Amino acid sequence: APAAVDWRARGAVTAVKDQGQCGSCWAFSAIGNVECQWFLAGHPLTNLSEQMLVSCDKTDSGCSGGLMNNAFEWIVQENNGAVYTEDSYPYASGEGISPPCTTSGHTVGATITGHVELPQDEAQIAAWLAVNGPVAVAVDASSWMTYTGGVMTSCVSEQLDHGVLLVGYNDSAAVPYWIIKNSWTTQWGEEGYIRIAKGSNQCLVKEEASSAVVG
């Protein structure tokens, strides 16, 4: 692996978004992973639709929660790989309640064929990300509300509750670290990002890492 990677510097990551009062983190994680994957497949960076998942993926639970894996599964086994563009299925759940789902004629902004699952090993996740781009991951984020910047070294790491996107790491530093995209607007953290220490499984970050596959 290289000493440091940051996919934002390669234009592979969209603007920081805002889930509102909806527990749809899982959606924003999964969709952000696909957005990056599509670009790295050689297509242009495009905002894809979390509202599609929140409203139409029935195996997950909309604003009451879900899982990135399920979402990749539902997209491929139930939605023929189609991830609609945001422009075409805009986000409407920011108030907290999620609208019903109805679908003549949306614009497919991306086609995935599957997903992969990464080992529960930070070095292995990093080697994959170094080659193939941002990784969907789960974390314990109970210590996060109070975050305003810096590298987290004492993350409460007891129980997973939130999905985010790993977009880089830096093993060069005195304290190595992951770079993670959150979905709580750019008001929160380091313009909407958080760095957490790398190598101590901070926030259980390695426990549930996965990625969509553009095939």
Ligand X SMILES: *[C@H](CC(=O)N1C(=O)C=C(OC)[C@@H]1C)[C@H](C)NC(=O)[C@H](CC(C)C)NC(=O)[C@H](CC(C)C)OC(=O)[C@H]([C@@H](C)CC)N(C)C
- Chain residues in the site for K ion (CB under 5 A): 117-118, 157, 209
Assess 31 for contact with ligand X (CB under 6 A). Answer: no
Given the residues 25, 56, 63, 203, select the one marked as catalytic.
Answer: 25
Binding to ligand X (CB under 6 A) within 151-190 occurs at 160-163
Work out the burial of residue 173: count CB atoms within 10 Å of its CB; fewer than 13 is exposed, 13-18 middle, 19 or more buried: middle
162/198 with CB nearer ligand X: 162
| Residue 167 burial class via C-beta count within 10 angstroms: exposed 0-12, middle 13-18, buried 19 and up | buried
Instruction: Identify the residue among 13, 30, 141, 167 touching ligand X (CB under 6 A).
Output: 141
Show the tokens assigned to 203: 């926030």
Q: What is the DSSP letter of 56?
A: H
Q: Does 192 bind ligand X (CB under 6 A)?
A: no
Sign of CA dihedral 56, 60, 65, 67: negative
Eight-state DSSP code of residue 88: T
Find the distance separating the first CA and the last CA of the chain, reported in whole Å: 23
Is 63 catalytic? The answer is no
Active-site residue (options: 33, 69, 79, 182):
182
Q: Which does 67 bind (CB under 5 to 8 A by kind): ligand X, K ion, none?
A: ligand X
Query: Exposed, middle or buried, 88 (CB in 10 Å: 0-12/13-18/19+)?
Result: middle
User: Of ligand X, K ion, none, which one sits near residue 195, judging by CB under 5 to 8 A according to partner kind?
Assistant: none
138 binds, among ligand X, K ion, none (CB under 5 to 8 A by kind): ligand X
> Which of 196, 192, 137 is CA-nearest to residue 165?
137
Give the shortest CB-3-to-ligand X separation in angstroms: 29
Residue 25 binds ligand X (CB under 6 A): yes
**Known catalytic membership, residue 80:** no
Residue from 48, 52, 67, 82 binding ligand X (CB under 6 A): 67
Question: Which residues are near ligand X by CB under 6 A?
Answer: 23, 25-26, 61, 65-68, 138, 141, 160-163
Catalytic residues: 25, 162, 182
